[PDB]
Design a binder for this molecule. Sequence first.
Ligand SMILES: *[C@@H]1O[C@H](CO)[C@@H](O[C@@H]2O[C@H](CO)[C@@H](O[C@H]3O[C@H](CO)[C@@H](O)[C@H](O)[C@@H]3O)[C@H](O)[C@H]2NC(C)=O)[C@H](O)[C@H]1NC(C)=O
Ligand SMILES: *[C@@H]1O[C@H](CO)[C@@H](O[C@@H]2O[C@H](CO)[C@@H](O[C@H]3O[C@H](CO)[C@@H](O)[C@H](O)[C@@H]3O)[C@H](O)[C@H]2NC(C)=O)[C@H](O)[C@H]1NC(C)=O
Ligand SMILES: *[C@@H]1O[C@H](CO)[C@@H](O[C@@H]2O[C@H](CO)[C@@H](O)[C@H](O)[C@H]2NC(C)=O)[C@H](O)[C@H]1NC(C)=O
Ligand SMILES: *[C@@H]1O[C@H](CO)[C@@H](O)[C@H](O)[C@H]1NC(C)=O
Ligand SMILES: *[C@@H]1O[C@H](CO)[C@@H](O)[C@H](O)[C@H]1NC(C)=O
Lengths: 144, 192, 127, 285, 50
Amino acid sequence: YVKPTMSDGTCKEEFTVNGDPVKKVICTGPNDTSPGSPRHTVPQCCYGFCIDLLIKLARTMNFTYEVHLVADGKFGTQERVNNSNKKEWNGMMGELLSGQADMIVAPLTINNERAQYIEFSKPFKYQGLTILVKKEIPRSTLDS
Amino acid sequence: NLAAFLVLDRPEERITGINDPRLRNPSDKFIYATVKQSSVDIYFRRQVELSTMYRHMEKHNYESAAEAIQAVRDNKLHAFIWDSAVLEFEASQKCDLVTTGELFFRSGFGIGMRKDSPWKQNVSLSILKSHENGFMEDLDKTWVRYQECDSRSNAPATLTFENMAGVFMLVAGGIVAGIFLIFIEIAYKRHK
Amino acid sequence: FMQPFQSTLWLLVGLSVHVVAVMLYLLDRFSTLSSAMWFSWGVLLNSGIGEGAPRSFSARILGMVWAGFAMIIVASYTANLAAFLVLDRPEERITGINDPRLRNPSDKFIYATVKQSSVDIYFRRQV
Amino acid sequence: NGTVSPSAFLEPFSADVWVMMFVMLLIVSAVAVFVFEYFFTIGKAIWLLWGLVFNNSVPVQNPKGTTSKIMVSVWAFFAVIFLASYTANLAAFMIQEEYVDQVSGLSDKKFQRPNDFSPPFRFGTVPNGSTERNIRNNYAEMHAYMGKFNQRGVDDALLSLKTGKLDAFIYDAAVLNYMAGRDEGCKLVTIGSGKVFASTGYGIAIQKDSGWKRQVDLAILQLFGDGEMEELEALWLTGICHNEKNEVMSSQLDIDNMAGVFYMLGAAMALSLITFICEHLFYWQ
Amino acid sequence: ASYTANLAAFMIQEEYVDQVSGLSDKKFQRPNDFSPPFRFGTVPNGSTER
Ligand SMILES: *[C@@H]1O[C@H](CO)[C@@H](O[C@@H]2O[C@H](CO)[C@@H](O[C@H]3O[C@H](CO)[C@@H](O)[C@H](O)[C@@H]3O)[C@H](O)[C@H]2NC(C)=O)[C@H](O)[C@H]1NC(C)=O
Ligand SMILES: *[C@@H]1O[C@H](CO)[C@@H](O[C@@H]2O[C@H](CO)[C@@H](O[C@H]3O[C@H](CO)[C@@H](O)[C@H](O)[C@@H]3O)[C@H](O)[C@H]2NC(C)=O)[C@H](O)[C@H]1NC(C)=O
Ligand SMILES: *[C@@H]1O[C@H](CO)[C@@H](O[C@@H]2O[C@H](CO)[C@@H](O)[C@H](O)[C@H]2NC(C)=O)[C@H](O)[C@H]1NC(C)=O
Ligand SMILES: *[C@@H]1O[C@H](CO)[C@@H](O)[C@H](O)[C@H]1NC(C)=O
Ligand SMILES: *[C@@H]1O[C@H](CO)[C@@H](O)[C@H](O)[C@H]1NC(C)=O
């Protein structure tokens, strides 16, 4: 969950039903509105499943961290590097194998390829796969 | 006859899922695709028995899930294949989205990077520790199962007045007769 | 006939008709005891029994709502019996290879083949 | 098995039918009394016309201004089409299938305090289980309730559920699915599609620091990616009744299944009470 | 009530179309005896035509 901040670099300190404040982190997110537009890293308010998951991990094993979103906003697989003769990765693991970011926290599946490249831990959250449609308004069709 | 007419008029169509006849072929009418260049892409690259639908995908693919659900909101891209949790979350939020049939590819999401890191064992340690204290249920009640409009009551469609609006103007015809027969009343004395 | 509506419902309506007849007689007392109950209990059956008209708008609305409930009950029961008999489909049309009964030895449904025949080795290929 | 909504009788038609019947009643009563004025009826008009559009159960003094008989007959035509459409659409609504909203999850508000509901919802399982360990570590009240409703096996809880001596069972997913698959009556279901506490799988135990671990994990993941789990799982760890439920037909319909009309019945007497006052204070006119 | 129910149930029949029993169907040999005559054909130069 990403939202823009004020000139102070912060944002509304929301709470929950029982009054517990929602954990906020400051994420330095590139301005990836359009390909070619100013795409530069600005402070933003970040919060969500991975955010409080990593804060829980930090509370457990006491690490320090930074958070930021990727530029292209894409998973990444073995694809041709600008119609060259080389099929390589891109996206999160594209820059992870390059050493840009240390650890990944995101709900990524585990196929065979990226598993061969890098090992994975236990699956923190189980999941399945479903088609989604915007149902249909119940209407009986007939003339008169 | 009218009873049989209206009761036998069932709505369409409840997508079964993998075993959908519409899924077995590129549906030019029904628009459905997935997020271009994603995990499902290589999933389908393993089973190229779907290869036909695969080259139906790029012709209507999307570069993000957010614009994919935005398309699902309006006419184009009526259906989108995706993980169960996000899609049921959006379904609970908007109260006008439905899941399929039976779910498939019963996978898991965890965490992993380069092999130079025994941190993943501590990650497994943390996930089991939260299994021993119920912390993923906290995440669920915060984000996933935050109540949020549990939709129900799938009625087999109703009947409304405008559908029968036609019969109504029939009485208007009789209203017209209110200005005709009442002169025929005088004509009843005129003829003799 | 009783499949749609329960004996409790029958008693309920048979007491409610008498109750509303008593109320109708009491209303008609204020500006007809046997004729009123006869008319109401004929209206329960949509019969032409009872030809009098209400002597006040209160009796008017009372008999009005009584007849309303009478016909709504009869409509509900005709629909209920309709749904009961139409939804009672016969069983069972065997699909064939994909029969759920075929996927397991049906102790109830007795089916087999001619012992030691071509189908025997056919099944010996697919054990 | 499911039930019928008490207020389902008004499901076919919204308030549109109420407002339309009232407005058409008033307009045609005005027209009829105006016609009769050309040749006493302003009061009986409502009774006559509603009897026409509703049911010919009460005799009415209808013959007045014989030319308006055309209008009252098309009125009766409205009647004979409207009643048909009602008895059809409502019957269609009555062909609902058994839903049973089940339990949303372990953290369902009903689950934590079943004693607030009559009767209290009873759940239990065999002790000395890891499930009991987790419940004791996290939920003391529900652990005490499970102790109140302890079991001793797997099939005994199944038969208790079959005969109504037990309301629910708590256990892992695989064996419950196996038990439900081959049931002859299919009278037992688990809900959640995997929505369970302590989400865990079947991790193969490996000797510590064994070199095979990585490659064998990659092999079983290749199997996981080969898309063969569906038919093997259908063959081995499931049953035949995992397809879907059926559209059951209701049993002997009880009053409560249409209790809404009974509610209106009460309202009827309320209305009569008001008119009783009109009888007691009618000395002003 | 029972009549309007049972007859409605009978009216929910599905399209049957008794089709043609076979090539030797009595209708097939002399379709001109029926109004309109049943018309069948195929491409010539075929083994079926032979
Ligand atoms: C885990 O829970 C139990 C912990 O004691 C263990 O043994 C069970 O103990 C209870 C309580 O003592 C026994 O209940 C009563 O059974 C008869 C009643 O007629 C008495 O003769 C016993 O003395 C006792 O009071 C259970 O019978 C007993 N269970 C068994 C199977 O012997 C359970 O065995 C443990 N369960 C598992 C699955 O390990
Ligand atoms: C088997 O049957 C045919 C035997 O001659 C053969 O050629 C077809 O011949 C007929 C009759 O001459 C042609 O019909 C007419 O077509 C146009 C009409 O506009 C005229 O220009 C022609 O001259 C002729 O009178 C067919 O057009 C002709 N068919 C073809 C495809 O050319 C068929 O070809 C044979 N069929 C097969 C499948 O081998
Ligand atoms: C991750 O790997 C192991 C798993 O916990 C950690 O090893 C522990 O080391 C701590 C001291 O740092 C000891 O007190 C524990 O006995 C060890 N536990 C186990 C199970 O090995 C290791 O320290 C963790 N890595 C980091 C960076 O903390
Ligand atoms: C984790 O514990 C170590 C050992 O005391 C401590 O120095 C550190 O502050 C904690 N976490 C980090 C890396 O800040
Ligand atoms: C339907 O289920 C109920 C319990 O919900 C049971 O009492 C009843 O007997 C069942 N009906 C049939 C026809 O089996």
